[PDB]
PDB file of C-alpha atoms in Angstrom:
ATOM      1  CA  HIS A  49     -42.986  62.704 -23.548  1.00  0.00           C
ATOM      2  CA  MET A  50     -43.299  60.571 -20.371  1.00  0.00           C
ATOM      3  CA  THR A  51     -40.174  60.481 -18.239  1.00  0.00           C
ATOM      4  CA  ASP A  52     -39.345  58.654 -14.968  1.00  0.00           C
ATOM      5  CA  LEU A  53     -39.305  62.006 -13.108  1.00  0.00           C
ATOM      6  CA  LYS A  54     -42.774  63.023 -14.471  1.00  0.00           C
ATOM      7  CA  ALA A  55     -44.225  59.597 -13.591  1.00  0.00           C
ATOM      8  CA  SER A  56     -42.797  59.745 -10.054  1.00  0.00           C
ATOM      9  CA  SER A  57     -43.864  63.316  -9.617  1.00  0.00           C
ATOM     10  CA  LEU A  58     -47.537  62.675 -10.495  1.00  0.00           C
ATOM     11  CA  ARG A  59     -47.555  59.678  -8.087  1.00  0.00           C
ATOM     12  CA  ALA A  60     -45.986  61.714  -5.351  1.00  0.00           C
ATOM     13  CA  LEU A  61     -48.594  64.523  -5.851  1.00  0.00           C
ATOM     14  CA  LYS A  62     -51.431  62.060  -5.483  1.00  0.00           C
ATOM     15  CA  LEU A  63     -49.853  60.623  -2.385  1.00  0.00           C
ATOM     16  CA  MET A  64     -49.163  63.917  -0.697  1.00  0.00           C
ATOM     17  CA  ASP A  65     -50.217  64.884   2.855  1.00  0.00           C
ATOM     18  CA  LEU A  66     -50.027  68.600   2.040  1.00  0.00           C
ATOM     19  CA  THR A  67     -49.019  70.225   5.305  1.00  0.00           C
ATOM     20  CA  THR A  68     -49.017  73.478   7.242  1.00  0.00           C
ATOM     21  CA  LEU A  69     -47.892  73.180  10.897  1.00  0.00           C
ATOM     22  CA  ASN A  70     -46.681  76.619  11.917  1.00  0.00           C
ATOM     23  CA  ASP A  71     -47.076  78.699  15.091  1.00  0.00           C
ATOM     24  CA  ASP A  72     -48.497  81.537  13.056  1.00  0.00           C
ATOM     25  CA  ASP A  73     -51.053  79.553  11.153  1.00  0.00           C
ATOM     26  CA  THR A  74     -54.467  81.030  10.682  1.00  0.00           C
ATOM     27  CA  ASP A  75     -57.765  80.100   9.073  1.00  0.00           C
ATOM     28  CA  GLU A  76     -56.762  82.105   5.984  1.00  0.00           C
ATOM     29  CA  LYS A  77     -53.536  80.097   5.512  1.00  0.00           C
ATOM     30  CA  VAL A  78     -55.394  76.814   5.984  1.00  0.00           C
ATOM     31  CA  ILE A  79     -58.043  77.846   3.413  1.00  0.00           C
ATOM     32  CA  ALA A  80     -55.249  78.696   0.988  1.00  0.00           C
ATOM     33  CA  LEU A  81     -53.700  75.246   1.665  1.00  0.00           C
ATOM     34  CA  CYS A  82     -56.973  73.552   0.854  1.00  0.00           C
ATOM     35  CA  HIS A  83     -57.143  75.366  -2.480  1.00  0.00           C
ATOM     36  CA  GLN A  84     -53.486  74.388  -3.164  1.00  0.00           C
ATOM     37  CA  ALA A  85     -54.459  70.714  -2.670  1.00  0.00           C
ATOM     38  CA  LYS A  86     -56.811  70.862  -5.606  1.00  0.00           C
ATOM     39  CA  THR A  87     -54.272  70.994  -8.481  1.00  0.00           C
ATOM     40  CA  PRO A  88     -54.734  70.981 -12.263  1.00  0.00           C
ATOM     41  CA  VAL A  89     -53.562  67.351 -12.490  1.00  0.00           C
ATOM     42  CA  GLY A  90     -55.357  65.927  -9.493  1.00  0.00           C
ATOM     43  CA  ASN A  91     -55.872  66.288  -5.757  1.00  0.00           C
ATOM     44  CA  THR A  92     -53.388  65.464  -3.003  1.00  0.00           C
ATOM     45  CA  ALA A  93     -54.301  62.542  -0.812  1.00  0.00           C
ATOM     46  CA  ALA A  94     -54.689  64.638   2.265  1.00  0.00           C
ATOM     47  CA  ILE A  95     -53.892  67.812   4.071  1.00  0.00           C
ATOM     48  CA  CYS A  96     -52.165  67.899   7.500  1.00  0.00           C
ATOM     49  CA  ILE A  97     -52.975  70.778   9.798  1.00  0.00           C
ATOM     50  CA  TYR A  98     -53.262  71.517  13.506  1.00  0.00           C
ATOM     51  CA  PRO A  99     -56.475  70.126  15.048  1.00  0.00           C
ATOM     52  CA  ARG A 100     -58.142  73.489  15.623  1.00  0.00           C
ATOM     53  CA  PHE A 101     -58.194  74.135  11.882  1.00  0.00           C
ATOM     54  CA  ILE A 102     -60.042  70.884  10.999  1.00  0.00           C
ATOM     55  CA  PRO A 103     -63.595  72.285  10.908  1.00  0.00           C
ATOM     56  CA  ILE A 104     -62.735  75.206   8.633  1.00  0.00           C
ATOM     57  CA  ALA A 105     -60.630  72.940   6.392  1.00  0.00           C
ATOM     58  CA  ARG A 106     -63.519  70.470   6.092  1.00  0.00           C
ATOM     59  CA  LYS A 107     -65.880  73.267   5.044  1.00  0.00           C
ATOM     60  CA  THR A 108     -63.384  74.608   2.509  1.00  0.00           C
ATOM     61  CA  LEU A 109     -62.671  71.217   0.973  1.00  0.00           C
ATOM     62  CA  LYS A 110     -66.406  70.589   0.660  1.00  0.00           C
ATOM     63  CA  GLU A 111     -67.139  73.929  -0.979  1.00  0.00           C
ATOM     64  CA  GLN A 112     -64.491  73.479  -3.627  1.00  0.00           C
ATOM     65  CA  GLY A 113     -65.841  70.052  -4.485  1.00  0.00           C
ATOM     66  CA  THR A 114     -63.014  67.894  -3.072  1.00  0.00           C
ATOM     67  CA  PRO A 115     -64.573  66.160  -0.021  1.00  0.00           C
ATOM     68  CA  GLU A 116     -62.355  63.123  -0.669  1.00  0.00           C
ATOM     69  CA  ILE A 117     -59.165  64.928   0.336  1.00  0.00           C
ATOM     70  CA  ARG A 118     -58.517  63.523   3.743  1.00  0.00           C
ATOM     71  CA  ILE A 119     -57.788  65.617   6.808  1.00  0.00           C
ATOM     72  CA  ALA A 120     -54.832  64.564   8.908  1.00  0.00           C
ATOM     73  CA  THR A 121     -53.583  66.186  12.008  1.00  0.00           C
ATOM     74  CA  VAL A 122     -50.873  65.759  14.681  1.00  0.00           C
ATOM     75  CA  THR A 123     -50.943  64.848  18.358  1.00  0.00           C
ATOM     76  CA  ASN A 124     -48.353  64.524  21.099  1.00  0.00           C
ATOM     77  CA  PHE A 125     -46.547  66.931  18.756  1.00  0.00           C
ATOM     78  CA  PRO A 126     -43.781  67.684  18.143  1.00  0.00           C
ATOM     79  CA  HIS A 127     -42.112  66.692  21.408  1.00  0.00           C
ATOM     80  CA  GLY A 128     -43.181  63.029  21.775  1.00  0.00           C
ATOM     81  CA  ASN A 129     -43.607  63.177  25.489  1.00  0.00           C
ATOM     82  CA  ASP A 130     -44.390  60.004  27.418  1.00  0.00           C
ATOM     83  CA  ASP A 131     -47.646  61.183  29.154  1.00  0.00           C
ATOM     84  CA  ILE A 132     -50.243  58.815  27.753  1.00  0.00           C
ATOM     85  CA  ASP A 133     -53.184  60.659  29.263  1.00  0.00           C
ATOM     86  CA  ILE A 134     -52.226  63.859  27.447  1.00  0.00           C
ATOM     87  CA  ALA A 135     -51.583  62.183  24.123  1.00  0.00           C
ATOM     88  CA  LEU A 136     -54.859  60.353  24.382  1.00  0.00           C
ATOM     89  CA  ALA A 137     -56.824  63.504  25.259  1.00  0.00           C
ATOM     90  CA  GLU A 138     -55.314  65.277  22.257  1.00  0.00           C
ATOM     91  CA  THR A 139     -56.177  62.310  20.045  1.00  0.00           C
ATOM     92  CA  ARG A 140     -59.754  62.255  21.307  1.00  0.00           C
ATOM     93  CA  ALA A 141     -60.003  65.965  20.582  1.00  0.00           C
ATOM     94  CA  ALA A 142     -58.628  65.508  17.121  1.00  0.00           C
ATOM     95  CA  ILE A 143     -61.292  62.884  16.494  1.00  0.00           C
ATOM     96  CA  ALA A 144     -63.983  65.189  17.838  1.00  0.00           C
ATOM     97  CA  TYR A 145     -62.878  68.041  15.624  1.00  0.00           C
ATOM     98  CA  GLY A 146     -63.419  65.701  12.719  1.00  0.00           C
ATOM     99  CA  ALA A 147     -59.975  64.308  11.772  1.00  0.00           C
ATOM    100  CA  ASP A 148     -59.812  61.505   9.270  1.00  0.00           C
ATOM    101  CA  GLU A 149     -56.241  60.626  10.357  1.00  0.00           C
ATOM    102  CA  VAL A 150     -54.090  61.339  13.397  1.00  0.00           C
ATOM    103  CA  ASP A 151     -50.275  61.418  13.283  1.00  0.00           C
ATOM    104  CA  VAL A 152     -49.088  60.819  16.857  1.00  0.00           C
ATOM    105  CA  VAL A 153     -45.495  61.300  17.977  1.00  0.00           C
ATOM    106  CA  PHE A 154     -43.999  58.168  19.539  1.00  0.00           C
ATOM    107  CA  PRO A 155     -42.291  58.682  22.980  1.00  0.00           C
ATOM    108  CA  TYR A 156     -38.875  58.265  21.391  1.00  0.00           C
ATOM    109  CA  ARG A 157     -36.847  59.773  24.259  1.00  0.00           C
ATOM    110  CA  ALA A 158     -38.385  57.218  26.580  1.00  0.00           C
ATOM    111  CA  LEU A 159     -37.328  54.440  24.259  1.00  0.00           C
ATOM    112  CA  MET A 160     -33.820  55.923  24.079  1.00  0.00           C
ATOM    113  CA  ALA A 161     -33.802  55.739  27.842  1.00  0.00           C
ATOM    114  CA  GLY A 162     -34.736  52.043  27.725  1.00  0.00           C
ATOM    115  CA  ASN A 163     -38.515  52.164  28.158  1.00  0.00           C
ATOM    116  CA  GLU A 164     -40.160  50.180  25.366  1.00  0.00           C
ATOM    117  CA  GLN A 165     -43.456  49.701  27.215  1.00  0.00           C
ATOM    118  CA  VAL A 166     -44.618  53.327  27.340  1.00  0.00           C
ATOM    119  CA  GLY A 167     -44.469  53.664  23.558  1.00  0.00           C
ATOM    120  CA  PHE A 168     -46.466  50.481  23.154  1.00  0.00           C
ATOM    121  CA  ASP A 169     -49.054  51.666  25.659  1.00  0.00           C
ATOM    122  CA  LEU A 170     -49.254  55.155  24.153  1.00  0.00           C
ATOM    123  CA  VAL A 171     -49.704  54.015  20.567  1.00  0.00           C
ATOM    124  CA  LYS A 172     -52.221  51.320  21.638  1.00  0.00           C
ATOM    125  CA  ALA A 173     -54.354  53.800  23.552  1.00  0.00           C
ATOM    126  CA  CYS A 174     -54.401  56.188  20.636  1.00  0.00           C
ATOM    127  CA  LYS A 175     -55.141  53.360  18.185  1.00  0.00           C
ATOM    128  CA  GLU A 176     -58.097  52.207  20.183  1.00  0.00           C
ATOM    129  CA  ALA A 177     -59.686  55.661  20.110  1.00  0.00           C
ATOM    130  CA  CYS A 178     -58.970  56.088  16.447  1.00  0.00           C
ATOM    131  CA  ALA A 179     -60.217  52.660  15.448  1.00  0.00           C
ATOM    132  CA  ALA A 180     -63.475  53.165  17.295  1.00  0.00           C
ATOM    133  CA  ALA A 181     -63.982  56.356  15.214  1.00  0.00           C
ATOM    134  CA  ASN A 182     -62.812  54.936  11.872  1.00  0.00           C
ATOM    135  CA  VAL A 183     -59.754  57.209  11.955  1.00  0.00           C
ATOM    136  CA  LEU A 184     -56.378  55.991  10.757  1.00  0.00           C
ATOM    137  CA  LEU A 185     -53.380  56.325  13.093  1.00  0.00           C
ATOM    138  CA  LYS A 186     -49.903  57.218  11.856  1.00  0.00           C
ATOM    139  CA  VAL A 187     -46.982  57.059  14.286  1.00  0.00           C
ATOM    140  CA  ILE A 188     -44.082  59.459  13.977  1.00  0.00           C
ATOM    141  CA  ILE A 189     -40.969  57.811  15.393  1.00  0.00           C
ATOM    142  CA  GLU A 190     -38.526  60.727  14.876  1.00  0.00           C
ATOM    143  CA  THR A 191     -35.728  58.905  13.128  1.00  0.00           C
ATOM    144  CA  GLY A 192     -33.421  61.919  13.249  1.00  0.00           C
ATOM    145  CA  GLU A 193     -33.448  61.889  17.008  1.00  0.00           C
ATOM    146  CA  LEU A 194     -33.374  58.085  17.458  1.00  0.00           C
ATOM    147  CA  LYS A 195     -30.408  57.990  15.054  1.00  0.00           C
ATOM    148  CA  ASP A 196     -29.305  54.441  15.564  1.00  0.00           C
ATOM    149  CA  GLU A 197     -30.648  51.723  13.236  1.00  0.00           C
ATOM    150  CA  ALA A 198     -31.561  49.423  16.109  1.00  0.00           C
ATOM    151  CA  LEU A 199     -33.657  52.122  17.742  1.00  0.00           C
ATOM    152  CA  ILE A 200     -35.403  53.029  14.446  1.00  0.00           C
ATOM    153  CA  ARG A 201     -36.211  49.374  13.981  1.00  0.00           C
ATOM    154  CA  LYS A 202     -37.451  48.977  17.580  1.00  0.00           C
ATOM    155  CA  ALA A 203     -39.628  52.061  17.513  1.00  0.00           C
ATOM    156  CA  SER A 204     -41.087  50.903  14.239  1.00  0.00           C
ATOM    157  CA  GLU A 205     -41.745  47.405  15.557  1.00  0.00           C
ATOM    158  CA  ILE A 206     -43.338  48.600  18.798  1.00  0.00           C
ATOM    159  CA  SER A 207     -45.567  50.974  16.892  1.00  0.00           C
ATOM    160  CA  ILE A 208     -46.675  48.228  14.482  1.00  0.00           C
ATOM    161  CA  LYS A 209     -47.382  45.810  17.297  1.00  0.00           C
ATOM    162  CA  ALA A 210     -49.423  48.459  19.115  1.00  0.00           C
ATOM    163  CA  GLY A 211     -51.561  48.949  15.967  1.00  0.00           C
ATOM    164  CA  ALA A 212     -50.043  51.784  13.853  1.00  0.00           C
ATOM    165  CA  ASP A 213     -51.709  52.039  10.438  1.00  0.00           C
ATOM    166  CA  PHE A 214     -48.639  53.963   9.133  1.00  0.00           C
ATOM    167  CA  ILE A 215     -45.132  54.588  10.420  1.00  0.00           C
ATOM    168  CA  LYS A 216     -43.826  58.083   9.666  1.00  0.00           C
ATOM    169  CA  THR A 217     -40.177  59.166   9.857  1.00  0.00           C
ATOM    170  CA  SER A 218     -40.292  62.578  11.414  1.00  0.00           C
ATOM    171  CA  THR A 219     -42.078  65.612  12.710  1.00  0.00           C
ATOM    172  CA  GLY A 220     -40.245  68.037  10.425  1.00  0.00           C
ATOM    173  CA  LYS A 221     -39.423  70.028  13.546  1.00  0.00           C
ATOM    174  CA  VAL A 222     -35.992  68.677  14.442  1.00  0.00           C
ATOM    175  CA  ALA A 223     -32.655  69.063  12.638  1.00  0.00           C
ATOM    176  CA  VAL A 224     -32.653  65.703  10.788  1.00  0.00           C
ATOM    177  CA  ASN A 225     -35.861  64.340   9.240  1.00  0.00           C
ATOM    178  CA  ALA A 226     -36.480  61.901   6.389  1.00  0.00           C
ATOM    179  CA  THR A 227     -33.458  60.263   4.785  1.00  0.00           C
ATOM    180  CA  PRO A 228     -33.311  57.470   2.233  1.00  0.00           C
ATOM    181  CA  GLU A 229     -31.511  55.222   4.733  1.00  0.00           C
ATOM    182  CA  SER A 230     -34.158  55.812   7.442  1.00  0.00           C
ATOM    183  CA  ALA A 231     -36.880  55.125   4.898  1.00  0.00           C
ATOM    184  CA  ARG A 232     -35.215  51.900   3.911  1.00  0.00           C
ATOM    185  CA  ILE A 233     -34.842  50.777   7.500  1.00  0.00           C
ATOM    186  CA  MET A 234     -38.502  51.431   8.352  1.00  0.00           C
ATOM    187  CA  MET A 235     -39.772  49.748   5.164  1.00  0.00           C
ATOM    188  CA  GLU A 236     -37.544  46.781   6.010  1.00  0.00           C
ATOM    189  CA  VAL A 237     -39.402  46.516   9.366  1.00  0.00           C
ATOM    190  CA  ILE A 238     -42.726  46.412   7.462  1.00  0.00           C
ATOM    191  CA  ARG A 239     -41.201  43.669   5.280  1.00  0.00           C
ATOM    192  CA  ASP A 240     -39.749  41.705   8.261  1.00  0.00           C
ATOM    193  CA  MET A 241     -43.030  41.722  10.139  1.00  0.00           C
ATOM    194  CA  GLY A 242     -44.951  40.761   7.010  1.00  0.00           C
ATOM    195  CA  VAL A 243     -47.370  43.660   7.491  1.00  0.00           C
ATOM    196  CA  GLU A 244     -47.242  45.068   3.957  1.00  0.00           C
ATOM    197  CA  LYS A 245     -51.077  44.847   3.753  1.00  0.00           C
ATOM    198  CA  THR A 246     -51.873  46.741   6.942  1.00  0.00           C
ATOM    199  CA  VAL A 247     -49.026  49.265   7.502  1.00  0.00           C
ATOM    200  CA  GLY A 248     -48.008  52.137   5.316  1.00  0.00           C
ATOM    201  CA  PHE A 249     -44.941  54.292   5.245  1.00  0.00           C
ATOM    202  CA  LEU A 250     -44.492  58.105   5.218  1.00  0.00           C
ATOM    203  CA  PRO A 251     -41.224  59.951   4.666  1.00  0.00           C
ATOM    204  CA  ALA A 252     -41.677  63.352   6.147  1.00  0.00           C
ATOM    205  CA  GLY A 253     -39.690  66.487   6.869  1.00  0.00           C
ATOM    206  CA  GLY A 254     -37.387  68.226   4.422  1.00  0.00           C
ATOM    207  CA  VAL A 255     -38.772  66.520   1.296  1.00  0.00           C
ATOM    208  CA  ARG A 256     -38.680  69.584  -0.967  1.00  0.00           C
ATOM    209  CA  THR A 257     -37.936  68.657  -4.561  1.00  0.00           C
ATOM    210  CA  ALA A 258     -39.341  66.357  -7.163  1.00  0.00           C
ATOM    211  CA  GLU A 259     -35.931  64.569  -7.213  1.00  0.00           C
ATOM    212  CA  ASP A 260     -36.147  64.008  -3.421  1.00  0.00           C
ATOM    213  CA  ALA A 261     -39.553  62.442  -3.780  1.00  0.00           C
ATOM    214  CA  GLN A 262     -38.294  60.233  -6.572  1.00  0.00           C
ATOM    215  CA  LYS A 263     -35.656  58.735  -4.299  1.00  0.00           C
ATOM    216  CA  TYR A 264     -38.242  57.567  -1.748  1.00  0.00           C
ATOM    217  CA  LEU A 265     -40.576  56.025  -4.301  1.00  0.00           C
ATOM    218  CA  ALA A 266     -37.602  54.194  -5.775  1.00  0.00           C
ATOM    219  CA  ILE A 267     -36.998  52.433  -2.451  1.00  0.00           C
ATOM    220  CA  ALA A 268     -40.670  51.523  -1.996  1.00  0.00           C
ATOM    221  CA  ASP A 269     -40.877  50.125  -5.526  1.00  0.00           C
ATOM    222  CA  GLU A 270     -37.705  48.080  -4.989  1.00  0.00           C
ATOM    223  CA  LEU A 271     -38.899  46.563  -1.756  1.00  0.00           C
ATOM    224  CA  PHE A 272     -42.571  46.016  -2.396  1.00  0.00           C
ATOM    225  CA  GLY A 273     -43.051  46.316  -6.161  1.00  0.00           C
ATOM    226  CA  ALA A 274     -44.395  49.251  -7.958  1.00  0.00           C
ATOM    227  CA  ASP A 275     -48.090  48.718  -7.117  1.00  0.00           C
ATOM    228  CA  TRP A 276     -47.737  48.752  -3.318  1.00  0.00           C
ATOM    229  CA  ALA A 277     -47.515  52.515  -2.807  1.00  0.00           C
ATOM    230  CA  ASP A 278     -51.130  53.610  -2.972  1.00  0.00           C
ATOM    231  CA  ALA A 279     -52.731  56.096  -0.596  1.00  0.00           C
ATOM    232  CA  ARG A 280     -53.406  53.505   2.128  1.00  0.00           C
ATOM    233  CA  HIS A 281     -49.786  52.457   2.083  1.00  0.00           C
ATOM    234  CA  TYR A 282     -47.720  55.533   1.234  1.00  0.00           C
ATOM    235  CA  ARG A 283     -47.843  59.307   1.672  1.00  0.00           C
ATOM    236  CA  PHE A 284     -45.407  62.212   1.334  1.00  0.00           C
ATOM    237  CA  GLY A 285     -45.590  64.397   4.411  1.00  0.00           C
ATOM    238  CA  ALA A 286     -44.623  67.791   3.070  1.00  0.00           C
ATOM    239  CA  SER A 287     -45.219  71.483   3.394  1.00  0.00           C
ATOM    240  CA  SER A 288     -42.933  72.635   0.595  1.00  0.00           C
ATOM    241  CA  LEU A 289     -42.874  69.914  -2.107  1.00  0.00           C
ATOM    242  CA  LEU A 290     -45.946  70.548  -4.226  1.00  0.00           C
ATOM    243  CA  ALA A 291     -44.639  73.460  -6.312  1.00  0.00           C
ATOM    244  CA  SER A 292     -41.601  71.419  -7.325  1.00  0.00           C
ATOM    245  CA  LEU A 293     -43.801  68.447  -8.384  1.00  0.00           C
ATOM    246  CA  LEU A 294     -46.090  70.689 -10.435  1.00  0.00           C
ATOM    247  CA  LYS A 295     -43.021  72.318 -12.080  1.00  0.00           C
ATOM    248  CA  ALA A 296     -41.681  68.879 -12.998  1.00  0.00           C
ATOM    249  CA  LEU A 297     -45.092  68.118 -14.576  1.00  0.00           C
ATOM    250  CA  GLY A 298     -45.159  71.373 -16.576  1.00  0.00           C
ATOM    251  CA  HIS A 299     -47.426  73.429 -14.335  1.00  0.00           C
ATOM    252  CA  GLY A 300     -44.198  75.322 -13.775  1.00  0.00           C
TER     253      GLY A 300
END
């Protein structure tokens, strides 16, 4: 019996960036994550791990026969500092480790203090390294710290102009992360700039239940139609969502 929640949940699974970003992470925990990404109904789109775990994750994904699960990682993370040289070095290392995708934190505090240029320059530098390596760049703007709609829009706009391939709400590491309103605002920037073809969206942080995921896909489908949200244009950034999706699908 198909239901809206089952349909949304299978979509969300296939769009997931299945994440572990903890101080106490180890190889064993990343190997387990890789195995969790290969589910009875399909694979997640990606995993998201700290850069040092990329080589062991690649090996694990290959040995279980799922080399098409992408490996994402994070840089300038979680603080979003405004030192471009550091963010770039971290991005270059992520590429060297073997990342398929890099999620860089935008220097949101600098923007809040009136500096629009440093976020442009930081994202552009990281984009140039990634592009040269055929690596996608996601930019985390930290909506829960920016707070104000105008600042969410501005950070989104700057990031897109600088070359972001995705805009991502949050690190998951601050008190407020993805919200439906924040998602709507960011997707409206994509719409307003006419960059639906080249920029994707990622709600991240605190997305824990199948009903939560459903709320975000509903906004995407309203704004861009139900075919837009494929893996190049949409992901769920989540550490603690998959079990709920599988339960909604009857693997729970």
